[PDB]
């Protein structure tokens, strides 16, 4: 099903934010399964890209949505 | 499961006094008050652009045409009070409140983190913002009327 | 349509941000608690919408993990 | 964009020696290892149930019929080396490598965090796992042949 566009916004934001958080751990905290985590983050980025194409589509169907680049901005 | 004529359950809307221009304390325990009314069951329509703070998703979203269609979000209420601990109180929609003709109220899922069942007040047909806001205002008024009917037994 | 792997990731990340930030909300004094509490109501609605979509994807693809494993507290 | 016949660009596949049941160091600077082959371009097909560890999403996923269709994931490669810092090295797929007949290689986006463009080797038509694995083995062998052709000019 199409997710609602608010759902896409949230998922994009959460994916971006977990990706920053786990990338920062990967580099600053020497975590226990670093190698597995690095591959997980590739999977997160691919998902991010799929969410981004879906949100570009939603931008053509709805009004009042924030632009993609604002959603993934570092706060 | 949607309700279309009368609500079958008491529902509670969290009130953050910071979100309003007027003082809305009057509405927590209201005497008969169809008068201008505070937009208590209005959903957010946009995410304000405050730099640094990540965007707040809008509760409901219009199509290109400017029409708000059903099942695209709406106004959140719950089936018990005090779900949102940081609110200033709950505006009450009693079991038996008349639902404005072009709105409906949808039962969504039980939320485990909040231990309450969420519901959404929503358009029943596509409508522009003004019409929706109008009906939500009448929904507030109906709820107040129904608070007095309940009080007089 | 999203790939089902995309829905898995979005479910996991939503769940995880919701926990981290519910924990702040209750333990810390974050700078805009009242805005954050509302934000989490929005996150939960999104979580539910992702869940309905994933239930669908479970009917169309094989080898996907069940929903309740994805949102497990690790 | 998808490539169907020959790759037009050199692509690199991270190799984590721990993932293989045997030594794959031979494949980092390979000899005549197109004569059994290590499954270097095989994607994960499942997420194992490891308690405590959150589920890994499979790189590719079949329909209910058991068929792996295009654009439903695949094997990850990039257009430069060392993208994954914690790998033991990169297996190299040189520009000009023959793509097995029922596979294709899709250019996805430039990834800013990794500063590299991601690509996905995927089925070009619906196929069962065994057929896909088979083609990915031939893709490894084509890449090795092509390394030696490139070396001889």
Swiss-Prot record, chain A:
Keyword Disulfide bond on entry: yes
Keyword annotations from UniProtKB, A to Z: Disulfide bond
Regions annotated as coiled coil: none
Domain of life: Bacteria
Matching InterPro entries: T6SS_Tsi2-like (IPR049070), Toxin_immunity_effector (IPR053756), Tsi2 (IPR033783)
Disruption phenotype: Deletion of Tsi2 is lethal in the presence of Tse2.
Record bears the keyword Disulfide bond: yes
Function field: Immunity protein that plays a role in preventing early activation of toxin Tse2. Binds to a large surface of Tse2 and thereby occludes the active site to specifically inhibits Tse2.
Subunit: Forms a heterotetramer with Tse2 consisting of two Tse2 dimers and two Tsi2 dimers. Formation of the complex inactivates Tse2 enzymatic activity.
Name of the protein in its database record: Immune protein Tsi2
Organism field: Pseudomonas aeruginosa (strain ATCC 15692 / DSM 22644 / CIP 104116 / JCM 14847 / LMG 12228 / 1C / PRS 101 / PAO1)
Lineage, highest ranks first: Bacteria, Pseudomonadati, Pseudomonadota, Gammaproteobacteria, Pseudomonadales
Swiss-Prot record, chains B, D:
Subunit annotation: Forms a heterotetramer with Tsi2 consisting of two Tse2 dimers and two Tsi2 dimers. Formation of the complex inactivates Tse2 enzymatic activity.
GO cellular component, one term: extracellular region
Species for this entry: Pseudomonas aeruginosa (strain ATCC 15692 / DSM 22644 / CIP 104116 / JCM 14847 / LMG 12228 / 1C / PRS 101 / PAO1)
Major localization listed first in the record, in broad terms: secreted
Superkingdom of this protein's organism: Bacteria
Alphabetically ordered keywords of this record: Secreted
UniProt xrefs under InterPro entries: ADPRTs_Tse2
Keyword DNA-binding assigned: no
Substitution effect: residue 13 to A: Complete loss of toxicity
S-S bridge residues: none
Compartment(s): Secreted
Annotated Pfam families: ADPRTs_Tse2
Protein name: Toxin Tse2
Record function comment: Toxin secreted by the H1 type VI (H1-T6SS) secretion system into the cytoplasm of recipient cells. Acts likely as a NAD-dependent cytotoxin towards both prokaryotic and eukaryotic cells.
């Amino acid at each position: 099903m199409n997710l609602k566009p608010q759902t896409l916004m949230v998922a994009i934001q959460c994916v971006a934010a977990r990706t920053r958080e786990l990338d920062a751990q990967l580099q600053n905290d020497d975590p226990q399964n670093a190698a597995e985590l690095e591959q997980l983050l590739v999977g997160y980025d691919l998902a991010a890209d799929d969410l981004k194409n879906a949100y570009e589509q939603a931008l053509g169907q709805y009004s009042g949505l924030p632009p993609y680049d604002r959603l993934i901005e570092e706060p | 499961s949607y309700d279309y004529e009368k609500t079958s359950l008491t529902l509670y809307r969290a009130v953050f006094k910071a979100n309003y221009d007027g003082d809305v304390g009057r509405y927590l325990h209201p005497d008969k008050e169809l008068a201008e009314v505070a937009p208590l069951l209005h959903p957010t329509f946009d995410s304000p652009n405050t730099p640094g703070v990540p965007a707040r998703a809008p509760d409901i979203v219009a199509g290109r045409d400017g029409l708000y269609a059903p099942d695209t979000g709406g106004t959140s209420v719950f089936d018990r009070a005090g779900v949102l601990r940081r609110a200033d109180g709950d505006f009450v929609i009693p079991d038996g409140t008349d639902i404005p003709p072009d709105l409906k109220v949808k039962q969504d899922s039980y939320n485990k983190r909040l231990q309450a069942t969420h519901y959404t007040i929503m358009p029943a047909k596509p409508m522009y913002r003004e019409v929706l806001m109008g009906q939500l205002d009448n929904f507030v008024r109906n709820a107040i009327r129904r608070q007095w009917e309940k009080a007089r037994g």
